[PDB]
Write an enzyme that holds these catalytic residues in place. Structure first.
Site, PDB file in Angstrom:
ATOM      1  N   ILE A  21       0.856  -1.180   0.000  1.00 54.91           N
ATOM      2  CA  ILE A  21       0.000   0.000   0.000  1.00 54.91           C
ATOM      3  C   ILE A  21       0.891   1.228   0.000  1.00 54.91           C
ATOM      4  O   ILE A  21       0.721   2.110  -0.839  1.00 54.91           O
ATOM      5  CB  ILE A  21      -1.011   0.005   1.180  1.00 54.91           C
ATOM      6  CG1 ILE A  21      -1.995  -1.160   1.047  1.00 54.91           C
ATOM      7  CG2 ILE A  21      -1.764   1.357   1.251  1.00 54.91           C
ATOM      8  CD1 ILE A  21      -3.011  -1.272   2.155  1.00 54.91           C
ATOM      9  N   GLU A  23       3.882   3.684   2.789  1.00 52.13           N
ATOM     10  CA  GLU A  23       4.494   3.928   4.089  1.00 52.13           C
ATOM     11  C   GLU A  23       3.519   4.741   4.953  1.00 52.13           C
ATOM     12  O   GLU A  23       2.948   5.727   4.494  1.00 52.13           O
ATOM     13  CB  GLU A  23       5.815   4.701   3.940  1.00 52.13           C
ATOM     14  CG  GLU A  23       6.865   3.993   3.094  1.00 52.13           C
ATOM     15  CD  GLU A  23       7.370   2.680   3.662  1.00 52.13           C
ATOM     16  OE1 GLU A  23       8.056   2.710   4.711  1.00 52.13           O
ATOM     17  OE2 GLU A  23       7.082   1.623   3.056  1.00 52.13           O
ATOM     18  N   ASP A 133      -3.610  14.073  17.919  1.00 52.39           N
ATOM     19  CA  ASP A 133      -3.067  14.203  16.563  1.00 52.39           C
ATOM     20  C   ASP A 133      -4.122  13.948  15.491  1.00 52.39           C
ATOM     21  O   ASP A 133      -3.915  13.268  14.496  1.00 52.39           O
ATOM     22  CB  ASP A 133      -1.856  13.272  16.338  1.00 52.39           C
ATOM     23  CG  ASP A 133      -0.977  13.719  15.175  1.00 52.39           C
ATOM     24  OD1 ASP A 133      -1.033  14.919  14.801  1.00 52.39           O
ATOM     25  OD2 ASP A 133      -0.219  12.884  14.656  1.00 52.39           O
TER      26      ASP A 133
HETATM   27  C1  LIG Z   1      -4.117   5.605  10.905  1.00 54.31           C
HETATM   28  C2  LIG Z   1      -3.529   6.167   9.643  1.00 54.31           C
HETATM   29  C3  LIG Z   1      -3.124   5.122   8.624  1.00 54.31           C
HETATM   30  O1  LIG Z   1      -3.251   3.917   8.833  1.00 54.31           O
HETATM   31  N1  LIG Z   1      -2.622   5.670   7.484  1.00 54.31           N
HETATM   32  C4  LIG Z   1      -1.936   5.148   6.385  1.00 54.31           C
HETATM   33  C5  LIG Z   1      -1.560   3.833   6.089  1.00 54.31           C
HETATM   34  C6  LIG Z   1      -0.926   3.900   4.912  1.00 54.31           C
HETATM   35  C7  LIG Z   1      -0.278   2.909   4.022  1.00 54.31           C
HETATM   36  O2  LIG Z   1      -0.901   5.179   4.486  1.00 54.31           O
HETATM   37  N2  LIG Z   1      -1.559   5.980   5.452  1.00 54.31           N
HETATM   38  C1  LIG Z   2      -6.023   0.345   8.289  1.00 52.09           C
HETATM   39  C2  LIG Z   2      -5.318   0.970   7.384  1.00 52.09           C
HETATM   40  C3  LIG Z   2      -5.705   0.982   5.955  1.00 52.09           C
HETATM   41  O1  LIG Z   2      -6.690   0.375   5.526  1.00 52.09           O
HETATM   42  N1  LIG Z   2      -4.880   1.728   5.140  1.00 52.09           N
HETATM   43  C4  LIG Z   2      -4.999   1.947   3.763  1.00 52.09           C
HETATM   44  C5  LIG Z   2      -5.712   1.233   2.795  1.00 52.09           C
HETATM   45  C6  LIG Z   2      -5.513   1.878   1.644  1.00 52.09           C
HETATM   46  C7  LIG Z   2      -5.950   1.664   0.245  1.00 52.09           C
HETATM   47  O2  LIG Z   2      -4.731   2.956   1.864  1.00 52.09           O
HETATM   48  N2  LIG Z   2      -4.408   2.991   3.249  1.00 52.09           N
END
Ligand SMILES: *CCC(=O)Nc1cc(C)on1
Ligand SMILES: CCC(=O)Nc1cc(C)on1
Ligand SMILES: *CCC(=O)Nc1cc(C)on1
Length: 337
Positions: A21, A23, A133
């Protein structure tokens, strides 16, 4: 063990068909197919920090529809072998940061998102916890626009009697969402710090742009004052610290920018609630339950369906590394066979 972008991402046989997905705040995040529940899930690799223990303890205690849960935690069976920890959560289509970069929100979507933020925040605050935050990237959304608050790494138990500090005290949480008092006389130990962040999020939903995009610590305050205008005598008198108060008195007079001029297409009830969340004086700032009861949210407001925590929640940055690792091992034990 499976590998992703040439790095170990070792989620065991339960989770297969990894896709990178991106970082996040902690490291590499993939989706994977959960072979038990027969759904794709999100998995974050953690590779300790007090923030990891704080997140895990809070998320495992909380149970709320608008707060992200932990489905599973993967780690080695022994402390000696434990290096990485993988946290498995519901896969969410997107987050409000990504959505605001790409999509205009309808008034109906803004109203529903704000309701769900406040509904989740009611529960957090009822547990005597501050998130500290809140920002668009910490609000996850699924394909049907169900919203879940995430990232409790900076959360604290509320401690209003110990909130006072001097002027220009350093702060950790994301700059654009910091209440004015953080720069003046506050450690961010009161619930009012989260309401300011929510106000900033609402403003950002109305225009797709951050309302107070400060480029450094004190510039954040001057963005806030550039819209709210100079504080009143009464609000200045509430700031007893002389360095903070005299800083404010040194500034030229700034006029308030009317909300209807900044957000000419906004619903008037949305702007009345925005005004109340973005109040300079944190003692005058609307609380989460009052915000839920505001006319803007009348379509959704139902306090019997806005649950609270069964008990208040209850430190970490005082413990050696071996002690923090041992505590993470203990907190994650329930997920072992
Ligand atoms: C809680 C925030 C979160 O999970 N954000 C996030 C994950 C990814 C891959 O990018 N933003
Ligand atoms: C729980 C975290 C989560 O589902 N993160 C994701 C999924 C996608 C797409 O982009 N960020
Ligand atoms: C500094 C005095 C102050 O603002 N206190 C206060 C206002 C309200 C609504 O409650 N306490």
């Amino acid at each position: 063990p499976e590998m992703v972008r040439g790095q170990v991402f070792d989620v065991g046989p339960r989770y297969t068909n990894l896709s990178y997905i991106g970082e996040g705040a902690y490291g590499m995040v993939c989706s994977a197919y959960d072979n038990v529940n027969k759904v794709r899930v999100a998995i974050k690799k953690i590779s300790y920090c007090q923030r990891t223990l704080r997140e895990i303890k809070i998320l495992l205690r909380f149970r709320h529809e608008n707060i992200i849960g932990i489905n599973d935690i993967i780690r080695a069976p022994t402390i000696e072998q434990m290096k990485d920890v993988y946290i498995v959560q519901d896969l969410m289509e997107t987050d409000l940061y990504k959505l605001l970069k790409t999509q205009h929100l309808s008034n109906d979507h803004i109203c529903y998102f704000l309701y769900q933020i406040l509904r989740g925040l009611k529960y957090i605050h009822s547990a005597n916890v501050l998130h500290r935050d809140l920002k668009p990237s910490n609000l996850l959304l699924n394909t049907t626009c169900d919203l879940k608050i995430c990232d409790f790494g900076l959360a604290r138990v509320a401690d209003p009697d110990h909130d006072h500090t001097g002027f220009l005290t350093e702060y950790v949480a994301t700059r654009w969402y910091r209440a004015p008092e953080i720069m003046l006389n506050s450690k961010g130990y009161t619930k009012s710090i989260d309401i300011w962040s929510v106000g900033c999020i609402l403003a950002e939903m109305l225009s797709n742009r951050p309302i107070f995009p400060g480029k450094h610590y004190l510039d954040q305050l001057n963005h806030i004052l550039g819209i709210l205008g100079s504080p009143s005598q009464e609000d200045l008198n509430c700031i007893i610290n002389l360095k903070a108060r005299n800083y404010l008195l040194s500034l030229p007079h700034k006029n308030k920018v009317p909300w209807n001029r900044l957000f000419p297409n906004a619903d008037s009830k949305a702007l009345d609630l925005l005004d109340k969340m973005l109040t300079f004086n944190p003692h005058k700032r609307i609380e989460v339950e009052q915000a839920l009861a505001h006319p803007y949210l009348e379509q959704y407001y139902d306090p019997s369906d806005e649950p609270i925590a069964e008990a208040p929640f209850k430190e970490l940055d005082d413990l050696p590394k071996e002690k923090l690792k041992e505590l993470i091992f203990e907190e994650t034990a329930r997920f072992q066979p």
